[PDB]
Amino acid sequence: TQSYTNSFTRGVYYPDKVFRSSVLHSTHDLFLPFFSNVTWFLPFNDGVYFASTEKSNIIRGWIFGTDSKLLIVNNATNVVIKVCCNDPFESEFRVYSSANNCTFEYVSQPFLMNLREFVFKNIDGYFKIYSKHTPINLERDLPQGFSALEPLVDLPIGINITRFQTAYYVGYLQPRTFLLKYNENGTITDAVDCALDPLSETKCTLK
Amino acid sequence: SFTVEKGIYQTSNFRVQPTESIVRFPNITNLCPFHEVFNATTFASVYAWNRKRISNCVADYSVIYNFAPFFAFKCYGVSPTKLNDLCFTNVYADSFVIRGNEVSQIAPGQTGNIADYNYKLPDDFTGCVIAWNSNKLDSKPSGNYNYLYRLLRKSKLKPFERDISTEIYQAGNKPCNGVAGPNCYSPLQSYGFRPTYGVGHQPYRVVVLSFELLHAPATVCGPKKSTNLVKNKCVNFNFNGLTGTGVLTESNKKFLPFQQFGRDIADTTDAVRDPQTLEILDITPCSFGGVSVITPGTN
Amino acid sequence: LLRKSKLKPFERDISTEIYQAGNKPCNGPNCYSPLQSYGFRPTYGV
Ligand SMILES: *[C@@H]1O[C@H](CO)[C@@H](O)[C@H](O)[C@H]1NC(C)=O
Ligand SMILES: *[C@@H]1O[C@H](CO)[C@@H](O)[C@H](O)[C@H]1NC(C)=O
Ligand SMILES: *[C@@H]1O[C@H](CO)[C@@H](O)[C@H](O)[C@H]1NC(C)=O
Ligand SMILES: *[C@@H]1O[C@H](CO)[C@@H](O)[C@H](O)[C@H]1NC(C)=O
Ligand SMILES: *[C@@H]1O[C@H](CO)[C@@H](O)[C@H](O)[C@H]1NC(C)=O
Ligand SMILES: *[C@@H]1O[C@H](CO)[C@@H](O)[C@H](O)[C@H]1NC(C)=O
Ligand SMILES: *[C@@H]1O[C@H](CO)[C@@H](O)[C@H](O)[C@H]1NC(C)=O
């Protein structure tokens, strides 16, 4: 299915691990634009905005990668990911048909603990993920408001992770310029896109 | 000038100097396992010298000194005093057990029986060589026979090659199949070990470290140690990888559990979290100012 | 290749007794001695 909806003012992650208070900061690099086309369900483009509702979601699957040669298992036990044809679906099965070196094993606890939002990015020398979970307010559409996106994992090795497969929403990201606001305690509460309407561009210029 | 008039002149500037030095790091993890090869129950034979490679780990070399007064510690190339700087590309540790006065044969350039037919070592190798006595662990008063060495074989071994090939030596001019008998011998003679043996015949355990370089990955493998800390004192601090000079003071901030750096409106560092322990400290620059000399007329 | 600390520019040293303090004069552990043997006589090429 290729159903479409509104992305709204969601999808902003922390540019860097720096603590600030009661200041505004202008940041470059890839972000998710406000009011974009999000596919309500693939060369991975530049980033992934996987925002599956999955209210209960006991276990679904977190297949990632790019000929029996990056798989992620989100079970309640340890994740255990490795860098290495099966298409799965008491046990799991249906996935132990391709085997390889499968090294770079780490992680201890599942990513899943509503609405879960995960942004995935890949740079020439790193694979970064960012995650956030928010309670639902009993509504189908995305909630109105703003929320942060903490960083979780930065895998040192990775080049061109392309293929992925888990109602969910999929959105892509492009380089942009944003203006973020830091509250008194040090968490992001508001953001402004500098290239949406002339008023926001004026706001970005005036800081 | 040699004369001055009435007035106040801004002459110089004054400041305080740091006293101590502070370095910190997020301890160590993924330590290279030197201990597992330095303390076991078996050590294998001579010609069947075990080979192992380890990489992608941090190195300590502190376990080396936690042993007996090593019989020999002649290390070529790198010096034990300066515990290297590079991570080379790969490292190998070879361990076995030999007999006393044969430890001299383990050398860059030499000749004999152990270093000629059993374990050949090239001159261009630098590495390090360690050997220590183990007479109290692998010598029973009934005759040890679990250690064997090769003593009859042609074609002296090329550097760094192992030949586990038991055959029947053809010393003579007749065909030889199965039983050696006359004009025919069998290599791999045993050792024998007793606790009352004289010095120079007692067993010795030998470990040789050989590492190679010139490749790209694994540049530097340092311990990245750390020291203590001080409060309320103008000092130079090197928390994690960020350096600075000033006075530290515990801060009542609200650092989120994924960030360590701290900034302000004017883009200056004013809050850093400790690498090892979890504590946030504000930074204040050391006192400084200007000096003015109020001087009346020099006349 | 061992003289401790660092060498000053345009300095020549003609002393060779021992390196480190060492256990006793130490004429095994410690007292590793300087001037590693320098044999270029084997032809390894250029
Ligand atoms: C965004 O997605 C496609 C653009 O190709 C379009 O069908 C859709 O109407 C657009 N707008 C929204 C709100 O989905
Ligand atoms: C969870 O997934 C990991 C990844 O393969 C696996 O090693 C582990 O056995 C799984 N645990 C359970 C309870 O299925
Ligand atoms: C292990 O897996 C691949 C594919 O089987 C193999 O070619 C290679 O040696 C290993 N891959 C990595 C990334 O080390
Ligand atoms: C990774 O995949 C992309 C296509 O998605 C390709 O252009 C690139 O060459 C690949 N990387 C390497 C090292 O071949
Ligand atoms: C900051 O944290 C303190 C901790 O007690 C809290 O009382 C205060 O409401 C917080 N301020 C915010 C979240 O703006
Ligand atoms: C050496 O023997 C075993 C094997 O490594 C080890 O567990 C033990 O702690 C060591 N003993 C001493 C005295 O170091
Ligand atoms: C590093 O190890 C020290 C030694 O136990 C510990 O006190 C410190 O908390 C550790 N730091 C970490 C795990 O970040």
Side-chain angles (χ1 to χ4, degrees), chain A residues 73 75 77-80 82 92 96:
Chain A
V73 192
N75 52 5
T77 42
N78 185 3
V79 184
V80 189
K82 300 146 309 302
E92 315 95 292
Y96 312 94

Side-chain angles (χ1 to χ4, degrees), chain A residues 183-185 187, chain B residues 254:
Chain A
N183 76 325
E184 187 39 61
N185 286 26
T187 178
Chain B
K254 280 319 284 145

Side-chain angles (χ1 to χ4, degrees), chain C residues 8-23:
Chain C
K8 275 310 144 287
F10 270 9
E11 208 266 2
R12 173 214 284 123
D13 187 31
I14 50 189
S15 78
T16 301
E17 274 80 8
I18 206 57
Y19 198 61
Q20 307 123 294
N23 300 355

